[PDB]
Protein backbone atom coordinates (compact mmCIF):
# COMPACT_ATOMS: atom_id res chain seq x y z
CA UNK A 1 0.00 0.00 0.00
CA UNK A 2 2.92 2.32 0.74
CA UNK A 3 4.98 0.75 -2.05
CA UNK A 4 3.35 2.37 -5.08
CA UNK A 5 3.00 5.91 -3.72
CA UNK A 6 6.52 5.82 -2.26
CA UNK A 7 8.08 4.39 -5.42
CA UNK A 8 6.35 6.88 -7.70
CA UNK A 9 7.36 9.68 -5.41
CA UNK A 10 11.06 8.83 -5.74
CA UNK A 11 10.74 8.78 -9.54
CA UNK A 12 8.98 12.16 -9.70
CA UNK A 13 11.56 13.55 -7.31
CA UNK A 14 14.33 12.47 -9.70
CA UNK A 15 12.30 14.11 -12.46
CA UNK A 16 12.34 17.41 -10.56
CA UNK A 17 8.59 17.54 -9.93
CA UNK A 18 8.80 18.16 -6.18
CA UNK A 19 5.29 19.51 -5.63
CA UNK A 20 3.93 16.24 -7.01
CA UNK A 21 6.61 14.37 -5.06
CA UNK A 22 5.51 15.88 -1.74
CA UNK A 23 1.90 14.70 -1.99
CA UNK A 24 2.97 11.14 -2.82
CA UNK A 25 5.37 11.01 0.13
CA UNK A 26 2.53 12.20 2.35
CA UNK A 27 0.32 9.35 1.16
CA UNK A 28 3.32 7.13 1.90
CA UNK A 29 3.24 8.32 5.48
CA UNK A 30 -0.52 8.01 5.95
CA UNK A 31 0.08 4.32 5.28
CA UNK A 32 3.23 3.92 7.38
CA UNK A 33 3.40 7.04 9.67
CA UNK A 34 6.86 6.22 11.00
CA UNK A 35 8.87 4.84 8.08
CA UNK A 36 12.14 6.85 8.01
CA UNK A 37 12.60 6.40 4.25
CA UNK A 38 9.34 8.24 3.47
CA UNK A 39 10.20 10.95 6.06
CA UNK A 40 13.64 11.23 4.52
CA UNK A 41 12.27 11.75 1.01
CA UNK A 42 9.50 13.97 2.34
CA UNK A 43 12.08 16.13 4.08
CA UNK A 44 14.27 16.24 0.95
CA UNK A 45 11.28 17.39 -1.06
CA UNK A 46 10.45 20.02 1.58
CA UNK A 47 13.94 21.53 1.34
CA UNK A 48 13.45 21.81 -2.44
CA UNK A 49 10.05 23.45 -1.92
CA UNK A 50 11.63 25.96 0.47
CA UNK A 51 9.87 24.37 3.48
CA UNK A 52 12.85 24.59 5.91
CA UNK A 53 11.46 24.21 9.44
CA UNK A 54 9.33 21.16 8.53
CA UNK A 55 12.41 19.47 7.04
CA UNK A 56 14.58 20.39 10.00
CA UNK A 57 11.95 18.78 12.23
CA UNK A 58 11.81 15.60 10.11
CA UNK A 59 15.58 15.32 10.09
CA UNK A 60 15.51 15.66 13.88
CA UNK A 61 13.01 12.82 14.27
CA UNK A 62 15.06 10.76 11.82
CA UNK A 63 18.31 10.97 13.77
CA UNK A 64 16.44 10.53 17.04
CA UNK A 65 14.59 7.32 16.18
CA UNK A 66 16.98 5.96 13.53
CA UNK A 67 20.52 7.23 14.37
CA UNK A 68 21.92 4.50 12.08
CA UNK A 69 20.17 5.88 9.00
CA UNK A 70 22.29 8.39 7.04
CA UNK A 71 19.18 10.11 5.72
CA UNK A 72 18.54 11.94 8.97
CA UNK A 73 21.97 13.55 9.08
CA UNK A 74 21.87 14.44 5.36
CA UNK A 75 18.41 16.00 5.61
CA UNK A 76 19.28 17.73 8.88
CA UNK A 77 22.61 18.79 7.38
CA UNK A 78 21.11 20.52 4.33
CA UNK A 79 18.43 22.10 6.49
CA UNK A 80 21.06 23.96 8.53
CA UNK A 81 22.70 25.26 5.34
CA UNK A 82 19.40 26.63 4.06
CA UNK A 83 19.02 28.39 7.42
CA UNK A 84 22.57 29.72 6.94
CA UNK A 85 21.84 31.38 3.61
CA UNK A 86 18.69 32.80 5.19
CA UNK A 87 20.91 33.87 8.09
CA UNK A 88 19.51 37.20 9.27
CA UNK A 89 22.73 37.90 11.18
CA UNK A 90 26.24 37.09 9.90
CA UNK A 91 27.30 35.33 13.09
CA UNK A 92 23.89 33.72 13.40
CA UNK A 93 24.70 31.93 10.16
CA UNK A 94 28.01 30.47 11.31
CA UNK A 95 26.30 28.64 14.14
CA UNK A 96 23.96 26.82 11.76
CA UNK A 97 26.92 25.89 9.53
CA UNK A 98 28.77 24.72 12.63
CA UNK A 99 25.78 22.47 13.40
CA UNK A 100 25.84 21.14 9.84
CA UNK A 101 29.52 20.24 10.23
CA UNK A 102 28.77 18.56 13.52
CA UNK A 103 25.91 16.46 12.20
CA UNK A 104 27.88 15.51 9.09
CA UNK A 105 30.72 14.44 11.37
CA UNK A 106 28.35 12.21 13.42
CA UNK A 107 27.09 10.72 10.17
CA UNK A 108 30.71 10.01 9.23
CA UNK A 109 30.80 7.72 12.27
CA UNK A 110 27.95 5.68 10.78
CA UNK A 111 29.69 5.39 7.40
CA UNK A 112 33.03 6.95 6.33
CA UNK A 113 32.75 5.75 2.75
CA UNK A 114 29.58 7.68 1.83
CA UNK A 115 30.27 10.13 -1.03
CA UNK A 116 27.33 12.49 -0.33
CA UNK A 117 28.60 13.20 3.18
CA UNK A 118 32.05 14.27 2.04
CA UNK A 119 30.36 16.29 -0.69
CA UNK A 120 28.15 18.06 1.84
CA UNK A 121 31.05 18.47 4.23
CA UNK A 122 33.01 20.22 1.49
CA UNK A 123 30.09 22.45 0.56
CA UNK A 124 29.83 23.35 4.25
CA UNK A 125 33.52 24.17 4.69
CA UNK A 126 33.27 26.45 1.65
CA UNK A 127 30.30 28.38 3.08
CA UNK A 128 32.53 28.70 6.15
CA UNK A 129 35.15 30.26 3.91
CA UNK A 130 37.34 27.26 4.61
CA UNK A 131 38.52 26.76 1.04
CA UNK A 132 41.32 24.50 2.27
CA UNK A 133 39.16 21.93 4.08
CA UNK A 134 36.51 22.10 1.35
CA UNK A 135 38.88 20.85 -1.36
CA UNK A 136 40.13 17.91 0.69
CA UNK A 137 36.54 16.85 1.49
CA UNK A 138 35.46 17.24 -2.12
CA UNK A 139 38.53 15.41 -3.38
CA UNK A 140 37.67 12.85 -0.74
CA UNK A 141 34.12 12.75 -2.10
CA UNK A 142 35.48 12.31 -5.62
CA UNK A 143 37.89 9.55 -4.57
CA UNK A 144 34.81 7.60 -3.44
CA UNK A 145 32.58 8.42 -6.41
CA UNK A 146 33.89 10.28 -9.46
CA UNK A 147 30.75 11.91 -10.84
CA UNK A 148 29.60 14.98 -12.76
CA UNK A 149 27.80 16.38 -9.72
CA UNK A 150 30.98 16.28 -7.65
CA UNK A 151 33.29 17.48 -10.45
CA UNK A 152 30.88 20.49 -10.56
CA UNK A 153 31.12 21.23 -6.83
CA UNK A 154 34.90 21.05 -7.18
CA UNK A 155 34.59 23.45 -10.12
CA UNK A 156 32.48 25.75 -7.98
CA UNK A 157 35.02 25.67 -5.15
CA UNK A 158 37.69 26.64 -7.70
CA UNK A 159 35.78 29.70 -8.84
CA UNK A 160 35.49 30.70 -5.18
CA UNK A 161 39.22 30.17 -4.64
CA UNK A 162 40.11 31.92 -7.88
CA UNK A 163 41.45 28.82 -9.61
CA UNK A 164 39.63 29.57 -12.87
CA UNK A 165 41.73 27.36 -15.14
CA UNK A 166 41.22 24.46 -12.73
CA UNK A 167 37.48 25.13 -12.46
CA UNK A 168 37.16 25.04 -16.25
CA UNK A 169 39.15 21.78 -16.27
CA UNK A 170 36.70 20.17 -13.85
CA UNK A 171 33.69 21.21 -15.96
CA UNK A 172 35.35 19.84 -19.12
CA UNK A 173 35.76 16.51 -17.32
CA UNK A 174 32.25 16.57 -15.84
CA UNK A 175 30.96 17.22 -19.37
CA UNK A 176 32.77 14.16 -20.69
CA UNK A 177 30.87 11.99 -18.21
CA UNK A 178 27.57 13.57 -19.27
CA UNK A 179 28.05 15.46 -22.60
CA UNK A 180 24.34 16.21 -23.09
CA UNK A 181 24.06 17.92 -19.69
CA UNK A 182 22.69 21.40 -20.29
CA UNK A 183 22.91 22.27 -16.62
CA UNK A 184 26.60 21.52 -16.93
CA UNK A 185 27.01 23.39 -20.26
CA UNK A 186 25.58 26.60 -18.83
CA UNK A 187 27.95 26.58 -15.84
CA UNK A 188 30.89 25.87 -18.13
CA UNK A 189 29.78 28.67 -20.47
CA UNK A 190 29.13 31.12 -17.67
CA UNK A 191 32.51 30.18 -16.22
CA UNK A 192 34.24 30.67 -19.60
CA UNK A 193 32.82 34.19 -19.38
CA UNK A 194 35.63 34.24 -16.81
CA UNK B 1 30.67 52.47 -13.08
CA UNK B 2 27.36 50.83 -12.13
CA UNK B 3 26.54 49.99 -15.76
CA UNK B 4 29.13 47.25 -16.31
CA UNK B 5 28.37 45.28 -13.11
CA UNK B 6 24.60 45.69 -13.32
CA UNK B 7 24.47 44.66 -16.97
CA UNK B 8 26.59 41.63 -16.15
CA UNK B 9 24.39 40.50 -13.29
CA UNK B 10 21.29 40.61 -15.45
CA UNK B 11 23.03 38.29 -17.88
CA UNK B 12 24.24 35.99 -15.09
CA UNK B 13 20.77 36.04 -13.54
CA UNK B 14 19.38 34.98 -16.92
CA UNK B 15 21.97 32.17 -17.07
CA UNK B 16 20.92 31.01 -13.60
CA UNK B 17 24.10 31.99 -11.73
CA UNK B 18 22.35 33.73 -8.84
CA UNK B 19 25.16 33.81 -6.26
CA UNK B 20 27.44 35.51 -8.82
CA UNK B 21 24.64 37.83 -9.92
CA UNK B 22 24.00 38.69 -6.27
CA UNK B 23 27.54 40.00 -5.90
CA UNK B 24 27.44 41.97 -9.16
CA UNK B 25 24.13 43.64 -8.25
CA UNK B 26 25.58 44.60 -4.85
CA UNK B 27 28.51 46.28 -6.57
CA UNK B 28 25.94 48.10 -8.69
CA UNK B 29 24.17 49.35 -5.59
CA UNK B 30 27.41 50.64 -4.11
CA UNK B 31 27.96 52.72 -7.24
CA UNK B 32 24.36 53.93 -7.42
CA UNK B 33 22.61 53.36 -4.01
CA UNK B 34 19.14 54.54 -5.02
CA UNK B 35 18.85 53.07 -8.51
CA UNK B 36 15.57 51.11 -8.41
CA UNK B 37 16.73 48.82 -11.20
CA UNK B 38 19.75 47.56 -9.22
CA UNK B 39 17.70 47.39 -6.02
CA UNK B 40 15.13 45.34 -7.94
CA UNK B 41 17.61 42.86 -9.44
CA UNK B 42 19.15 42.45 -5.99
CA UNK B 43 15.81 41.68 -4.32
CA UNK B 44 14.86 39.34 -7.16
CA UNK B 45 18.12 37.44 -6.78
CA UNK B 46 17.59 37.29 -3.01
CA UNK B 47 14.27 35.54 -3.68
CA UNK B 48 16.06 32.94 -5.86
CA UNK B 49 18.77 32.58 -3.20
CA UNK B 50 16.24 32.08 -0.38
CA UNK B 51 16.95 35.42 1.32
CA UNK B 52 13.22 36.19 1.67
CA UNK B 53 13.21 38.87 4.40
CA UNK B 54 15.78 41.18 2.75
CA UNK B 55 13.81 40.93 -0.51
CA UNK B 56 10.46 41.78 1.06
CA UNK B 57 12.08 44.82 2.67
CA UNK B 58 13.68 45.86 -0.65
CA UNK B 59 10.38 45.17 -2.38
CA UNK B 60 8.62 47.50 0.05
CA UNK B 61 11.18 50.25 -0.44
CA UNK B 62 10.77 50.08 -4.25
CA UNK B 63 6.99 50.30 -4.37
CA UNK B 64 7.25 53.19 -1.91
CA UNK B 65 10.07 55.16 -3.56
CA UNK B 66 9.33 54.20 -7.16
CA UNK B 67 5.51 53.57 -7.31
CA UNK B 68 5.35 53.69 -11.14
CA UNK B 69 7.96 50.92 -11.42
CA UNK B 70 6.35 47.50 -11.84
CA UNK B 71 9.49 45.67 -10.72
CA UNK B 72 8.97 46.46 -7.05
CA UNK B 73 5.40 45.13 -7.23
CA UNK B 74 6.45 41.81 -8.76
CA UNK B 75 9.22 41.31 -6.17
CA UNK B 76 7.17 42.33 -3.13
CA UNK B 77 4.40 40.05 -4.35
CA UNK B 78 6.79 37.12 -4.87
CA UNK B 79 8.28 37.70 -1.44
CA UNK B 80 4.80 37.49 0.12
CA UNK B 81 4.33 34.12 -1.53
CA UNK B 82 7.73 33.00 -0.26
CA UNK B 83 6.57 33.88 3.25
CA UNK B 84 3.25 32.14 2.61
CA UNK B 85 4.98 28.86 1.81
CA UNK B 86 7.11 29.28 4.93
CA UNK B 87 4.08 30.14 7.09
CA UNK B 88 3.92 28.27 10.38
CA UNK B 89 0.34 29.23 11.27
CA UNK B 90 -2.39 28.56 8.68
CA UNK B 91 -4.01 32.02 8.89
CA UNK B 92 -0.67 33.85 8.81
CA UNK B 93 -0.25 32.22 5.41
CA UNK B 94 -3.51 33.60 4.08
CA UNK B 95 -2.60 37.09 5.26
CA UNK B 96 0.65 36.92 3.31
CA UNK B 97 -1.11 35.52 0.25
CA UNK B 98 -3.65 38.30 0.71
CA UNK B 99 -0.88 40.88 0.89
CA UNK B 100 0.28 39.45 -2.46
CA UNK B 101 -3.03 39.95 -4.25
CA UNK B 102 -3.11 43.53 -2.96
CA UNK B 103 0.32 44.48 -4.27
CA UNK B 104 -0.70 43.03 -7.62
CA UNK B 105 -4.01 44.90 -7.62
CA UNK B 106 -1.87 47.99 -6.96
CA UNK B 107 0.34 46.98 -9.86
CA UNK B 108 -2.48 46.61 -12.37
CA UNK B 109 -3.30 50.26 -11.64
CA UNK B 110 0.08 51.45 -12.93
CA UNK B 111 -0.15 49.26 -16.03
CA UNK B 112 -3.19 47.00 -16.63
CA UNK B 113 -1.47 45.53 -19.68
CA UNK B 114 1.66 43.93 -18.19
CA UNK B 115 1.37 40.15 -18.70
CA UNK B 116 3.78 39.14 -15.88
CA UNK B 117 1.47 40.82 -13.34
CA UNK B 118 -1.47 38.78 -14.63
CA UNK B 119 0.76 35.71 -14.40
CA UNK B 120 1.47 36.29 -10.68
CA UNK B 121 -2.13 37.23 -9.92
CA UNK B 122 -3.13 33.89 -11.44
CA UNK B 123 -0.51 32.20 -9.31
CA UNK B 124 -1.76 33.74 -6.06
CA UNK B 125 -5.41 33.02 -6.76
CA UNK B 126 -4.47 29.40 -7.41
CA UNK B 127 -2.76 29.28 -4.02
CA UNK B 128 -5.91 30.66 -2.35
CA UNK B 129 -7.95 27.84 -3.87
CA UNK B 130 -9.65 30.20 -6.32
CA UNK B 131 -9.04 28.19 -9.50
CA UNK B 132 -11.96 29.88 -11.24
CA UNK B 133 -10.20 33.24 -10.84
CA UNK B 134 -6.74 31.79 -11.50
CA UNK B 135 -7.64 30.56 -14.99
CA UNK B 136 -9.11 33.94 -15.85
CA UNK B 137 -5.93 35.67 -14.67
CA UNK B 138 -3.71 33.25 -16.58
CA UNK B 139 -5.89 33.48 -19.68
CA UNK B 140 -5.64 37.25 -19.22
CA UNK B 141 -1.85 37.04 -19.15
CA UNK B 142 -1.85 34.61 -22.04
CA UNK B 143 -3.98 37.03 -24.08
CA UNK B 144 -1.32 39.66 -23.46
CA UNK B 145 1.79 37.50 -23.95
CA UNK B 146 1.33 33.95 -25.22
CA UNK B 147 4.60 32.48 -23.86
CA UNK B 148 5.74 28.91 -23.00
CA UNK B 149 6.04 30.05 -19.39
CA UNK B 150 2.40 31.15 -19.08
CA UNK B 151 1.02 28.10 -20.88
CA UNK B 152 3.04 26.02 -18.40
CA UNK B 153 1.39 27.91 -15.53
CA UNK B 154 -2.03 27.33 -17.09
CA UNK B 155 -1.28 23.63 -17.62
CA UNK B 156 -0.27 23.45 -13.96
CA UNK B 157 -3.64 25.00 -13.15
CA UNK B 158 -5.38 22.39 -15.29
CA UNK B 159 -3.57 19.61 -13.46
CA UNK B 160 -4.80 21.04 -10.17
CA UNK B 161 -8.39 21.27 -11.44
CA UNK B 162 -8.23 17.71 -12.75
CA UNK B 163 -8.22 18.49 -16.48
CA UNK B 164 -5.40 16.17 -17.55
CA UNK B 165 -6.27 16.26 -21.25
CA UNK B 166 -6.25 20.07 -21.28
CA UNK B 167 -3.16 20.31 -19.11
CA UNK B 168 -1.39 18.15 -21.68
CA UNK B 169 -2.76 20.25 -24.50
CA UNK B 170 -1.31 23.34 -22.88
CA UNK B 171 2.08 21.64 -22.51
CA UNK B 172 1.87 20.51 -26.15
CA UNK B 173 1.30 24.10 -27.20
CA UNK B 174 4.17 25.38 -25.06
CA UNK B 175 6.49 22.80 -26.60
CA UNK B 176 5.59 23.95 -30.11
CA UNK B 177 6.79 27.42 -29.02
CA UNK B 178 10.02 26.05 -27.57
CA UNK B 179 10.59 22.47 -28.85
CA UNK B 180 14.07 22.29 -27.28
CA UNK B 181 12.94 23.24 -23.77
CA UNK B 182 13.99 20.10 -21.86
CA UNK B 183 12.55 21.25 -18.54
CA UNK B 184 9.33 21.64 -20.51
CA UNK B 185 9.59 18.12 -21.91
CA UNK B 186 10.05 16.70 -18.40
CA UNK B 187 6.94 18.36 -17.01
CA UNK B 188 4.92 17.20 -20.01
CA UNK B 189 6.20 13.64 -19.62
CA UNK B 190 5.46 13.79 -15.89
CA UNK B 191 1.95 14.94 -16.76
CA UNK B 192 1.46 12.13 -19.29
CA UNK B 193 2.54 9.75 -16.53
CA UNK B 194 -0.77 10.69 -14.88
UniProtKB/TrEMBL annotation, chains A, B:
Lipid metabolism is among the record's keywords: no
Protein origin, superkingdom: Bacteria
TPR repeat intervals: 2-35, 148-181
Keywords: Repeat, Signal, TPR repeat
Protein name (database record): Hypothetical conserved protein
Coverage span on the entire protein: 28 to 221 of 355
